[PDB]
Design a protein around this ligand. Structure first.
Ligand code: FAD
Ligand code: FAD
Ligand code: NAP
Ligand code: NAP
Lengths: 316, 316
């Protein structure tokens, strides 16, 4: 087994990992980046992106990530295709174990993301990128003045429904239970939009099937109530499955301070804002952000992490 | 005199203001953006940009900003060419007075930047974008393994010198006084690089002239010492004038909490991170960031500000 030492190691090949790589390479730090299993991150699972600033037309998630990969390799970032399964952050240098070897480093940037879960239905899988989506902030504007459905019961779903009711003609919130398990302020605003507006509630329903045509989604079939099998049918142009994200942080449990699985950073306006609870370990992207979750905020913290890492490595 | 009300008003047409505009427009908020006098921000004063992620080749600051302008107008952002001279943020709606009218709004995003100062020399003005620069993080990699000069005595200059000594073969720090007025940790690391390395000190000198050829800077002439007129000459490929930035916040004094002229935001990992001391007023870009100062971090906080503004406007 091999053991490669690097001054700076970056975990993840999403927008945060690639931006941290171009900033680290241009700081002459010679970064090594480990891609993980999903080479290019969550953006490779989507079709059109029209909120990456400065790219008004013709951008897709795959094309953005190919450009970011080109950018990192232009400045000679060593890119390694591997995935980390064990970590030891309590001894110096930090040791990380992959499938293809052992890695040690003096500074670490963690940009392992927070992947969206789906329902697992074949009909849902069929319409991904053509009507079924997992990000309302990104894709909500394509369904402006149209009917939309959101499925879920926690915080994300009530937030997605609330955000979407300002864009769509109406929002259909679908949930298995007869009650939402979201924050008190979210549920208050939800019930105001149910009563005086835009959101139609469909509690005690489960999604059976996503129907549609050649261009995409046209409807949704629901079933059940509290004791019965009624089977509803909704005419809808888009579906937003909002059942939660999975921050890829299991490997860091007991090593780093986490908050609902998200890596806690120092934050603040006085620098060293991406530093985790361990000196020399920094986090960027969706793994440390459960509020905004965009490629542009992930690239922004990717940049901050590389400059924090540079300042750490130089004794400041 | 006219008084135009807008639900959301954005101040500034740099990367933070334009990204907040595309996120606000795609949230169906119908943003109005006031450009200020410098239409396109600080990036219009630079030549090549090769740290905007996903753009490996052929980007210049003017081209990025033209693309961001196209992006904002594609989503029907109302762009107004005006500059704000007076503000009243203590009454609702917020009132802002420009040269071309009065504006009121329910939520405000301030993205007015922090402009770099220069020495005012004709020879320096002659070589801007071709050897004279004000951002070491951005432009430092172009002078890799070459001789570089930095001029200044505060925090920025010692930081720029320290950052540049890892890229350049040697750094020549030029200062009027016989001592630097930077942080204790910065001066410690500085004196270590002076003694065991890369940084050559030139205290009690003032820059007289920046010389160069058709392609750019080739030298620098200094003069004086503590009582005498010796006149030095340095062979150098780049000059970094690091004499300070000017956050455009005079209009907000006594209205908002400032910290060395920078707008203080809430920050943190629990949302509403761009909110200033006044509810409903948010800040983004270099006006609230004195540490990273990049177009990508400005676009990231621009995005955060628009989503914070959306959540505020919807009672969350
Ligand atoms: C359906 C959908 C559409 C979206 N559309 C948009 C859009 O239009 N615009 C937008 O702004 N945002 C969009 N987003 C959000 C965007 O995808 C994420 O914000 C962004 O990808 C997060 O960047 P990241 O670098 O933090 O993580 P990710 O892109 O999630 O990348 C994480 C990386 O870490 C690696 N990794 C994980 N575990 C390990 C490990 N143990 N060892 C090593 N590497 C590991 C992975 O392989 C991957 O490369 C969308 C999201 C979804 C799900
Ligand atoms: C020489 C140089 C080169 C640089 N190169 C790079 C680079 O290669 N890459 C990089 O990442 N960064 C670079 N930067 C840094 C980058 O320019 C800034 O980080 C970025 O422009 C800040 O964005 P912003 O939107 O916060 O503010 P700015 O771009 O500074 O824009 C501020 C806006 O606010 C407006 N405004 C000001 N006052 C008022 C008012 N009272 N009313 C209304 N509007 C007002 C202005 O007109 C302007 O449109 C460089 C900076 C300099 C100086
Ligand atoms: N603090 C905040 O403001 C905030 C905001 C956004 C995100 N976050 C973070 O992001 C994480 C994930 O967001 P979340 O809370 O929405 O995820 P979550 O905690 O998993 O809640 C989503 C819920 O959707 C329901 N569901 C699952 N499968 C379903 C199906 N087939 N049909 C219908 N309903 C189904 C489940 O609730 P039931 O068991 O009730 O059915 C599930 O728990 C959070 O845990 C948090 O860390 C926090
Ligand atoms: N907290 C931090 O870590 C940090 C870091 C970066 C930036 N910042 C922020 O950014 C602001 C600006 O940075 P700064 O401190 O460098 O600016 P500054 O406070 O203006 O200091 C720069 C100094 O350069 C000197 N100078 C001016 N003209 C010169 C010339 N012609 N030749 C040589 N020297 C000349 C002056 O010092 P003399 O009077 O001594 O000659 C001047 O005060 C700060 O005030 C702060 O708000 C803070």
């Amino acid at each position: 087994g091999t053991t490669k030492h690097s001054k700076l190691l970056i975990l993840g090949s999403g927008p945060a990992g690639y931006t941290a790589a171009v900033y680290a390479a241009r700081a002459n730090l010679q970064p090594v980046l480990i891609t993980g299993m999903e080479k290019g991150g969550q953006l490779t699972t989507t079709t059109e992106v029209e909120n990456w600033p400065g790219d008004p037309n013709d951008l897709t998630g795959p094309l953005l990530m190919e450009r970011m990969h080109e950018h990192a390799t232009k400045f000679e970032t060593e890119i390694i295709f591997d995935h980390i399964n064990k970590v030891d952050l309590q001894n110096r240098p930090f040791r990380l174990n992959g499938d293809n070897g052992e890695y040690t480093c003096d500074a670490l940037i963690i940009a392992t993301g927070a992947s969206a879960r789906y329902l697992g239905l074949p009909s849902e899988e069929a319409f991904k990128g053509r009507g079924v989506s997992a990000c309302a902030t990104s894709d909500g504007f394509f369904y402006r003045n149209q009917k939309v459905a959101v499925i879920g019961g926690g915080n994300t779903a009530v937030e997605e429904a609330l955000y979407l009711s300002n864009i769509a003609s109406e929002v259909h919130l679908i949930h298995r239970r007869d009650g939402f398990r979201a924050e008190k302020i979210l549920i208050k605003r939800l019930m105001d939009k149910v009563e005086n507006g835009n959101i139609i509630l469909h509690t005690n329903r489960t999604l059976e099937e996503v129907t549609g045509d050649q261009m995409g989604v046209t409807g949704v079939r629901l079933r059940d109530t509290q004791n019965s099998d009624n089977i509803e049918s909704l005419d809808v142009a888009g579906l937003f499955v909002a059942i939660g994200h999975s921050p890829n942080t299991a490997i860091f449990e007991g090593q780093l301070e986490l908050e609902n699985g998200y890596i806690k950073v120092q934050s603040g306006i006085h620098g060293n804002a991406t530093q985790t609870s361990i000196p020399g370990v920094f986090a960027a992207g969706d793994v440390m952000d459960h509020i905004y979750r965009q490629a542009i905020t992930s690239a922004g913290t990717g940049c901050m992490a590389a400059l924090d890492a540079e300042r750490y490595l130089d004794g400041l």
